[PDB]
Structures are given as C-alpha cells and as structure tokens.
Design a protein around this ligand. Structure first.
Ligand SMILES: CCCCCn1cc2cc(Nc3cc(=O)n(Cc4ncn(C)n4)c(=O)n3Cc3cc(F)c(F)cc3F)c(Cl)cc2n1
Ligand SMILES: CCCCCn1cc2cc(Nc3cc(=O)n(Cc4ncn(C)n4)c(=O)n3Cc3cc(F)c(F)cc3F)c(Cl)cc2n1
Lengths: 300, 301
C-alpha cells in the first residue's frame, strides 16, 4: 500500500564531486562556482580525534585542495569555512546546477539521500530525521559528504550533509550551512544520541492514510485538547505536537473529514489500550516515517 | 552501517523519459537514440481499451497521429512499428542523453529500480522485485503507464520492465522491453487475477544475513537441516524452492558472518513454524523477501 519513495536523483547526481586533502577524501556538492563539503576533509588521521579546524585551515591554501568531477580536476580559487562546512570556490560554474535552496528541516521531516562514494552516486533512498536528530540511514565508509534533499517543482531543497556514523549505527550530519542537527561535533570521538521517541505527527498521517484506504476501526466518538494529548503522548515516548504539525495535517483532515483532535483521541486510545490483536494497513506496528506530505504524494 | 530498500540513481533514465499522445490517449515513453518505446495501449481510444485488436488499430494509424514531447519540444515521428505489446516510434532526432544500455528479461525474485513518471515527467524512484506470480507490488497511480524498471552496472542501464497496468488487487503488471508480459496477463482493460503468490526464499535468507551483519541475531539457533528437509517445510508454507545455486550465491554472506547457509535455513524454518512472536527483524514485523543476495552484498560491503 505504502512504501518509502525517493525523489528522482538526477538533478543532484550532476552536482556530486570528490574533494581530497592529502589522502583524506570525501564527497562534495558543486553548485554554481562553489563546492560544499564537510570541513573534516582537512584533517589528517592524527587531527581527526580532536581537530583544531581554525589552526588546520590557516595552514591551507587553494592549491592544497583536489576537487574532481569524475577524473576532471576543478581548480580551486578561494576557500572558507562556515560552521562545519568548507566552501571551495572553483573556476567553473557547474552547468548542471539546478534551481536550489538550502533548508534546515525539523525532526519527522523526510528527505531523499543520494549515497555516494568517491564522488560517484551509488544509491538513493528516503529517510526521516529522528526526534534525537539522528537518521537511520544506510551508509558505508566513504559516504561522508553525501546529501539529503527534497524536490518541489523544479527546485532542489538540500537539507542534509552526512558527516558521521555514531556508535549505535545511526547517522549524524549538518545542514548545508554546516550547522549540525543535534548535539554532535565533527570529531572522531564516541558521541551518544539522546533517547529517541516516536514521531507523533507522522503516526497521525499514517492513521489518515489508513482511513483513506478504508481501514478505520480505530476511529472513536471522543476528542481531546492538544495540550491534554501532548501530556499523555509523552508518557508513551511519543513526541508532542506543535502548531505547525496540526497545520500540516490540515489537508488529510479535510480529505477524510476527520478533525485532527479526533484523530489524536483515536491515537490516544491505541496508546492506552494497544491494538488488541488488530492491524492497521496490514501491520501491527504504527509507522512513523511517512509525513503528511508523503501520504498525499502517494495516495493522490 | 544500516539497512534500507535502496534504488539505483535514476538520472540516466530521467533523461530518456518523454510523453506520447495518440488522439487524447497519453502515457510515458522511453527515448533511446532515435526510437521511442512505449506501451501500445496508447493507440487505443476509450472504447478500444476494453477489447483492442492491436494489428487492426495500428494499420489505421500513420506517423502524424503520434505526438511525442520531450519537455516542451515536439519530436517528429518518421516511422512506427509494434513489437508484441511495445510500440516503437522512430523520431528524426537522437537523444543525446542516451546511456549505454541493454534490454533484459528478469527472473522472478530479481529486483530492480522503478522510475515512476507522469506525463513524461519523473516523479519518484523505488526498488521492487518481480514476484513469483509475475506481478510487482509497485507504487503507481493513474498516468504511470510506460514507466520503466532498470538496474545499473558500472555505466550500463539494463532495462527490464515497462509498466502497463494495475490489477484489481492493487498489484501491477507489465512487460519487458521486447513487449512480452511477465505473467499470464494481456493489455486490455478487463479484470485480471494473478496466480497465487509465493515467498522468495533465497531473498528472505539474504535479508536474515543482512540482519546478522547489522547486529540483529535473536532468530539464530543451532538446529541443523538438510536442504531437502528445509525445502519440504518451505513448500508447505508457500515458499519457493531453494536450489544448490541459491546456496552457492549465499556463500559470500555465509563466509562473512560465519553462519552456514543450512544453519540460516534452520533459523528460517523455526521462524515459519513458530512465528516472530511480536519481535521484529531490522525493524520489520514480517519476513522481507525483496532483497537479493547481490542487493545485500552491495549495501553491506
Ligand atoms: C581510500 C581510503 C580512505 C582515504 C583516507 N580517509 C580516511 C577517512 C576517514 C573519514 N572519516 C569518516 C568517513 C565516513 O565516510 N564516515 C561516514 C560513515 N557513515 C557510515 N560509515 C560506516 N561511515 C564517517 O563517519 N567518518 C568518520 C567521521 C567523519 C566526520 F566528518 C567527522 F566529523 C567525524 C568522524 F568520525 C573521512 Cl571523512 C575521510 C577519510 N579519508
Ligand atoms: C491526460 C488526459 C487524458 C488522458 C486520456 N487517457 C486515459 C488513459 C487511460 C490509460 N489506462 C491506464 C493508465 C495507467 O496509467 N495505468 C497504470 C496504473 N498503475 C496504477 N494505476 C492506478 N494505473 C493503467 O493501468 N491504465 C489502464 C490500462 C493500461 C494498459 F496499458 C492496459 F493494457 C490495460 C489497462 F487497463 C492509459 Cl494507458 C492512457 C490514457 N490516456
């Protein structure tokens, strides 16, 4: 009925390059005449534990950076660091640059990842930002600098640049302005992700999806306030809803004629009483990685 | 390192998608060199769709009845022919974005990436498997007809699927790029059922190996089984036979994890007989069968 679908990756494939400093190598993003990549590339192995990035960078010049589009070198003509990203100005404007923007997403929002190795795209999949600001991605060694994105009409919104894998196997990274999602830093030390929670807004979208498809046994004749719902949800390790979350459920609410706070009351009964041997959309688990926009993308 | 359904990057296929229109009937086509491939269903009017005689319908068309649009550019059609359920429209301009490619017919259990398109415009990409009953469990809406499935090796696109229709059960049926259906289906708007489906055993075993590689091992045991005794239980539960070639293909994953293939079989046997008891594997409550051994090797190594 529903599966993770990625955006077509072509517009992003044409922007992927490789960046190397010494033997340190990773992926970068070539837009107009700038290449963006994790500043970790300037680290030697001995720097990686506890880098002084200001110190490392002032010892670099343009001629120390090898940027390659496949095997074609792009000459670097300027360099700077913005938070945890390196910005290399190159002498060639990428002719495959799409219309684009840089956005910072919230937990629960989904995006497509183009996993790349040595500047070469390998695979594309959808994933969600967890409430603890990690992603349950699929990434091997060499994936650093792979990007996440959404496409809205002809415009690519880049939201994620991959930096590191955490001890538990989840992934951490930054926006394209180099600000980390979550309390992580770009050093090769063990950092733990905070306890994760269930993405309530996406579970509600999934219940709407089930209603659209005629599976609606869980609808009740009760309602709740948002505040009371939020207080109860927290006791089952569910995220509180924001005003923005209520608003993004508006289209599904309209399509089904089920008020958001009535769906909240339905979810509240499921939390308190369980599924009691029943399934929703053929599954005993509530899915939390499909957004309201994903549901309308796939149903309509 | 993680485990997700992962598609091939779609860009090489995106640059080949076009819109084809015949009268008011419209769908997607695939532009390679100077030929556009699309479902022959596009030659049908509404009334034709229910019970078409395609040789008759085609003889009654000429080149100028076909409108091919690549974005807003119209490609002039200078020839037409039909190969089984695929129409081939020769156009007067070569597609410069044509990748290295081949046409391949896949076997049940093999996986591929789908590029879902609408009105010639790519919409989404995801991974599917050819089911044992020759359906696919896709994600397709009205207007997806002509979307293609493919695999990429190095720089060469192997096209294996052209989407035609959705069955009443909500699964999907289509052809290879020589226009032959997968399965007992026909390109007519009439209700069609598939054969009873079965589970792709070698793929379930591949996925259990992925689970072990990613640290989820609760289901392992030390029952031992023979291939033959595993196959008897598999058959009983509507699972496809596991062959010695399948065992061979799982060898690299067995070596990596230290778990013999027949020991993984013993684990699967117990899962079938006992269930998962509300536990999950790689976050799934069900035994996943749409990852091949090659898929697992590629994503885990
Ligand atoms: C040809 C042979 C290597 C050429 C020489 N060399 C070695 C290197 C090692 C590196 N390190 C990492 C690469 C990498 O892909 N991933 C991601 C990933 N995600 C799933 N996994 C398993 N790993 C990753 O976590 N790291 C660690 C890491 C990255 C960060 F940015 C950071 F702030 C903190 C860190 F601890 C990097 Cl960035 C470059 C390299 N060059
Ligand atoms: C633009 C404004 C005027 C549009 C005028 N118009 C109407 C049309 C209807 C059509 N039909 C279908 C389109 C379609 O996308 N899918 C796929 C899909 N997959 C998930 N779903 C739900 N449907 C699909 O099953 N069909 C049915 C079908 C297709 C076959 F090839 C076939 F042999 C037998 C069939 F019954 C077609 Cl092909 C062209 C059309 N043009």
């Amino acid at each position: 009925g529903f599966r993770k679908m990625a955006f077509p990756s072509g517009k992003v494939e044409g922007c992927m390059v490789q960046v190397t400093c010494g033997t340190t190598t990773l992926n970068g993003l070539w837009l107009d005449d700038v290449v963006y990549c994790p500043r970790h590339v300037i680290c030697t192995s001995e720097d990686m534990l506890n880098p002084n990035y200001e110190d490392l960078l002032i010892r670099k010049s343009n001629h120390n950076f090898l940027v390659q589009a496949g095997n074609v070198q792009l000459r670097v003509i300027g360099h700077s660091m913005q938070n945890c990203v390196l910005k290399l100005k190159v002498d060639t404007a990428n002719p495959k640059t799409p219309k684009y923007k840089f956005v910072r997403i919230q937990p629960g929002q989904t995006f497509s990842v183009l996993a790349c190795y040595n500047g070469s795209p390998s695979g594309v999949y959808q994933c969600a930002m967890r409430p603890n600001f990690t992603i349950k991605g699929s990434f091997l060694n060499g994936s650093c600098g792979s990007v996440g994105f959404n496409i809205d009409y002809d415009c690519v919104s880049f939201c994620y640049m991959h930096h590191m894998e955490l001890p538990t196997g989840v992934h951490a990274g930054t926006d394209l302005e180099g600000n980390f999602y979550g309390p992580f830093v770009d050093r090769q030390t063990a950092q733990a992700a905070g306890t994760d929670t269930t993405i309530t807004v996406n579970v509600l979208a999934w219940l709407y999806a089930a209603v659209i498809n005629g599976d609606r046994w869980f609808l009740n004749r009760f309602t709740t306030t948002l505040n009371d719902f939020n207080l109860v949800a927290m006791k089952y390790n569910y995220e509180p809803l924001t005003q923005d979350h209520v608003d993004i459920l508006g289209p599904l609410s309209a399509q089904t004629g089920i008020a958001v706070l009535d769906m909240c009351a339905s979810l509240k009964e499921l939390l308190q009483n369980g599924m009691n041997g029943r399934t929703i959309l053929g599954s005993a688990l509530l899915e939390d990685e499909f957004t309201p926009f994903d549901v309308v993308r796939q149903c309509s």
